[PDB]
Design a protein around this nucleic acid. Structure first.
Ligand SMILES: [Mg+2]
Ligand SMILES: [Mg+2]
Ligand SMILES: [Mg+2]
Ligand SMILES: [Mg+2]
Lengths: 153, 154
DNA sequence: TCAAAACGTCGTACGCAGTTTTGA
DNA sequence: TCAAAACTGCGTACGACGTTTTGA
């Protein structure tokens, strides 16, 4: 568990509000108790030509990794506990994605508890709905309603 | 000249490297002594639904305006003199657009002496070439060489 | 199972210009 | 003539998902 330079957090919050993405998903996966994975992702996108910038993120955040996909690359942070540490420090400086940040911090904390009750899990699922509401969501499919519509069994 | 708070500059540089644009142009306009205007623009683009963000920049930078062209909006800063003050304090915190900014800054300084000479005017136009090379330029037409092949017809 | 990684899809929301006009 | 504003075109570089696989 590490602490970040505030001047680095400020700059990064601006960049994240620009080209970053704080993403929460419900993934239809039969292998899970409630037939769905709760997925949290922090991501920063950039033209692969500027992959060096993303490399620096990995170095400076100390965790996460870069993935290439043709012309575009992504810094990706998915691991729940480093995500929590990082987002908790970033969140106060975000202006466009602060709500998304806080909802994710929230979702994370309620995660053991959500693996117990079919309707605690659905509650966390609605928090995910809120995150996508705040984002410029366009191709979403699996909402919280498609989750209770499955628990109908 | 207004001096900006460092925390504001830091966040903003990050946002500018994300969704901003530092733009230099050679505009074919025959009302100009060399048949072209040197145009410098600092721009921040955003979905109009989030206009408030851009409108706050107007408050915080204390100059510039916002225009809405349908689904997106822009904060625009063109006035050469506040542009210089602003980009001077912002530039140390930029990481992707630092070069563009420093280039725009010295285009501004040499702008009077470029009124003087067609040669000094072409040198300056070279700097505009460099700004566009550093950007993700895709639809450029008028270059420093377009200017040369027009100053020759004389 | 589950956290996490891997791999693909899709519609913009940006960026980066162009052209033309204003108003002394 | 000029600084500056106004208006327009266009091709991504992003954003924000989906679907499937890993590896104990
Ligand atoms: Mg953006
Ligand atoms: Mg929305
Ligand atoms: Mg960008
Ligand atoms: Mg380039």
């Amino acid at each position: 568990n590490t602490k970040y330079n505030k001047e680095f957090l400020l700059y990064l919050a601006g960049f994240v509000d620009g080209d970053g993405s704080i993403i929460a998903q419900i993934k239809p996966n039969q292998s899970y108790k409630f037939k769905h994975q709760l997925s949290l992702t922090f991501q920063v996108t950039q033209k692969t030509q500027r992959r060096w910038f993303l490399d620096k993120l990995v170095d400076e955040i100390g965790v996460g990794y870069v993935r290439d996909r043709g012309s575009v690359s992504n810094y990706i942070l998915s691991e729940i506990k480093p995500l929590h540490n990082f987002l908790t420090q970033l969140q106060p400086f975000l202006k466009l994605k602060q709500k998304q940040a806080n909802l994710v911090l929230k979702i994370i904390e309620q995660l053991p508890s959500a693996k117990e009750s079919p309707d605690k899990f659905l509650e966390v699922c609605t928090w995910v709905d809120q995150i996508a509401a705040l984002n410029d969501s366009k191709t979403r499919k699996t909402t919280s309603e498609t989750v209770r519509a499955v628990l109908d069994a």
